[PDB]
Write a protein that binds this ligand. Structure first.
Ligand SMILES: [Cl-]
Ligand SMILES: [Cl-]
Length: 285
């Protein structure tokens, strides 16, 4: 064996949930923008759209209860390209630098690599080297804990138990979606009833989820609401993620945030033209 070092050759097992019982800390519902935002709220209040970070086992119960109270088919939209799953009910990720373990891979290969990784853990009596986020950030690669394996599960296990559907859109962390994934999101929305509830999530519940919320908003409203107002209103509810802000916590990620913003500007124009009569796909546009 080898202690991890955050390279694609020797990636780290990082536990995202403090425990299997940890609460959801970036849960929000897009429709609440209508109750909070002081600008243009046209077209917001009828969305059936919630989002979060990656839940713990118990977190899925909280999300299901939140959705039930608001309520229709529910689709959980996992935006994560990177391999992830659960070890004894705790959310875990296979982490290389900038959380890009599956960067450049086909979606097929990303799934195969995840399921092979999880199968390897599942076959062990004990898993070693499980880092917390603070330990990973501090590069304390050899200070991870061991866990006696009770269960190793993918997200689908928990989502299906709640009677929800699962659909994966493979977006690299900190980046814009690729054209295939944009087409897949637009089609998913078109191909399900207008009343469908989507619970959207990524790893941290920040950039990817907010990007997708903005895309949903543009697809419905870009012909009547300005780009500026869409982005600002999506920033008005917790966690207050403003897609305009491209200088964030990690300076080395600025290029990707900038490219994501340019994507959003182009998607806005596509969405507006689609509401004005353009019948083709994003890739064709
Ligand atoms: Cl298992
Ligand atoms: Cl406006």
């Amino acid at each position: 064996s080898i202690v991890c070092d955050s390279t694609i050759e020797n990636p780290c097992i990082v536990q995202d949930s403090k425990t299997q019982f940890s609460p959801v800390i970036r849960y929000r519902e897009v429709a609440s923008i209508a109750d909070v935002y002081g600008g243009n709220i046209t077209g917001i209040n009828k969305f059936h759209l919630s989002g979060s970070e990656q839940p713990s086992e118990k977190g899925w119960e909280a999300i299901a209860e939140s959705i039930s109270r608001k309520m229709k088919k529910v689709i959980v939209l996992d935006l994560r390209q990177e391999s992830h799953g659960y070890l004894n009910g705790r959310a875990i990720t296979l982490v290389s630098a900038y959380n890009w373990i599956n960067l450049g891979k086909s979606n097929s290969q990303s799934t195969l690599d995840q399921e092979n990784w999880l199968a390897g853990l599942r076959s062990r009596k004990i898993v070693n080297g499980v880092l917390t986020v603070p330990q990973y950030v501090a590069k304390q690669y050899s200070q991870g804990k061991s866990m006696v394996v009770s269960t190793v599960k993918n997200e689908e296990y928990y989502v299906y138990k709640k009677g929800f559907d699962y659909y994966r859109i493979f977006i690299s962390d900190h980046r814009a979606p690729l054209d295939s994934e944009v087409d897949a999101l637009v089609a998913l929305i078109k191909n399900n009833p207008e009343d469908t509830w989507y619970h959207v999530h990524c790893r941290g519940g920040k950039g990817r989820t907010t990007t997708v919320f903005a895309m949903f908003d543009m697809l419905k409203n870009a012909d009547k609401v300005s780009f500026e107002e869409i982005i600002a209103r999506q920033a008005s509810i917790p966690p207050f993620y403003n897609l305009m802000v491209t200088n964030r916590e990690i300076p080395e990620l600025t290029p990707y945030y900038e490219q994501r913003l340019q994507f959003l500007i182009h998607f806005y124009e596509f969405a507006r033209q689609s509401l004005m009569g353009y019948s083709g796909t994003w890739s064709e546009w």
